[PDB]
Structure 1
Amino acid sequence: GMASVLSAATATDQGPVRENNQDACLADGILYAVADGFGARGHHASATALKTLSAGFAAAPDRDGLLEAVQQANLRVFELLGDEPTVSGTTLTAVAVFEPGQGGPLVVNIGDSPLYRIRDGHMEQLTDDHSVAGELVRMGEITRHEARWHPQRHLLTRALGIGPHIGPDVFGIDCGPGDRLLISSDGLFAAADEALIVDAATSPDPQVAVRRLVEVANDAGGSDNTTVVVIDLG
């Protein structure tokens, strides 16, 4: 029989516009994550968040430990960056592909770096975006497609590292053998045709998929950093 995780891949692309790649990603064991930093020290925010997340999860690799690790990541980023004259911080979306005995696969997310499930050729977003546009989706006022073009898409309503308390979303992931999970920064959906994103995201080899995903985003203009983590489930 097959393992729960068959394989995983990551890619990140600065793009031709941004002067820094302030995204970060993690793929290690059953833990996968993307962090999209913002502000003058957004690179520091996303890298520190993932370093802290990784260490905390390793110390306690269960649901409560993951949640604790996210809390510790928040506090560490805020302790390091909170006295700056402008605000820097990061999104964080973390997936732990737990076995059923540990409650099954789990997502913890803050900000707007979505988790998607790819199943039978369809790609759908499982997480809510904590942005002005994303809150309008959560309120049932606009569609996710509409949110891509909303003029305040870029303004976050929740972020890691900006204050001492955070309330991430936490939920099980309804997935199973043959599904693919994708974690992405918001750069992926900045501009490109959705069909071509899906074409890339369904590439059978996950290492091809991640390269094609960031190429699609770059070819469309590369206005933002794009980072993707693909996980194939068995």
Structure 2
Amino acid sequence: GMASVLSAATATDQGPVRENNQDACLADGILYAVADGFGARGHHASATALKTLSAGFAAAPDRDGLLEAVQQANLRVFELLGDEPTVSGTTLTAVAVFEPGQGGPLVVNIGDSPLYRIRDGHMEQLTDDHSVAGELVRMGEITRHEARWHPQRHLLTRALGIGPHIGPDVFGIDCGPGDRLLISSDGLFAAADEALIVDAATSPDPQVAVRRLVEVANDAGGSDNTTVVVIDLG
């Protein structure tokens, strides 16, 4: 029979507008993550977060170890960037594809880099966004689609590396053999037609999928960095 992860792929794209690629991604064993940095030192924030995350998970690869690794990533970024004259930080969305004996697949997320499940041709967002617009979705006041065009969607309500304390969301991922998971920065949904995003995201070869996802975002104007991690489950 089949492994729980069949294959995975990643892509990151600065796009034609931004002066830096302040996104970062990670694909290492059963650990997958995206971090979208912001601010003058946002690239430092996201890269440092993932380096720390990776090391902490490797030292303790279970649910509690993952959550401690996220705390350590927060602390390390805040120690390095907290004395700057303006605020820089990062989002973080991490997936660990644990076996059932370790509680099954888990997502830990802070900010607005979503996790999606792709099943039977449908793409749905599993995480809530910690942004002004995302909170209105969490309040049942606007839809995810409306949140996409909300004029305050760019304003985060939770972020890593901006203070000594963080409260990420933590939850199991309802998924199984045949599903595809996608972690993305918000650049993917900045502008493009949702149908074309789903077309790209359902490409059979995950290496093709990640390339096509970046291209869809770019073709639509590439106003932000776009980073995607695709994981095919067995």
TM-score computed with the length of structure 1 as normaliser = 1.00
Please provide the CA RMSD for this pair: 0.1
Distance (Å, rounded) in 1 between the aligned partners of 2:16 and 2:209 = 21
Q: Which runs of 5+ in 2 are unaligned?
A: none
User: 2:13 corresponds to which residue?
Assistant: 13
Distance (Å, rounded) in 1 between the aligned partners of 2:151 and 2:16 = 22
Q: CA deviation at 1:8?
A: 0.1
Q: CA deviation at 1:146?
A: 0.4
Q: CA deviation at 1:76?
A: 0.1
Structure 1 segments of 4+ aligned residues over 6 angstroms from their partners: none
SS of residue in 1 equivalent to 2:25: strand
Counterparts of 1:7-86 in structure 2 under 5 Å? 7-86=7-86
Q: CA deviation at 1:69?
A: 0.0
Q: CA deviation at 1:201?
A: 0.1
Q: CA deviation at 1:147?
A: 0.4
Distance (Å, rounded) in 1 between the aligned partners of 2:192 and 2:80 = 35
Distance (Å, rounded) in 2 between the aligned partners of 1:218 and 1:151 = 21
The answer to whether structure 1 residue 188 and structure 2 residue 183 are counterparts is no
Distance (Å, rounded) in 2 between the aligned partners of 1:31 and 1:132 = 28
Distance (Å, rounded) in 1 between the aligned partners of 2:31 and 2:81 = 25
SS of residue in 2 equivalent to 1:161: coil
Q: CA deviation at 1:116?
A: 0.1
User: 1:148 corresponds to which residue?
Assistant: 148
Distance (Å, rounded) in 2 between the aligned partners of 1:199 and 1:221 = 18
Q: CA deviation at 1:52?
A: 0.0
Q: CA deviation at 1:83?
A: 0.2
TM-score computed with the length of structure 2 as normaliser = 1.00
Q: Identity of paired residues, percent? A: 100
Q: Which runs of 5+ in 1 are unaligned?
A: none
SS of residue in 1 equivalent to 2:213: helix
The answer to whether structure 1 residue 88 and structure 2 residue 91 are counterparts is no
Aligned residues: 234
Q: CA deviation at 1:43?
A: 0.1
Q: Deviations over 1:7-56 (max 9, x none)?
A: 00000000000000000000000000000000000000000000000000
Distance (Å, rounded) in 2 between the aligned partners of 1:65 and 1:78 = 20
Distance (Å, rounded) in 1 between the aligned partners of 2:155 and 2:35 = 16
User: 1:158 corresponds to which residue?
Assistant: 158
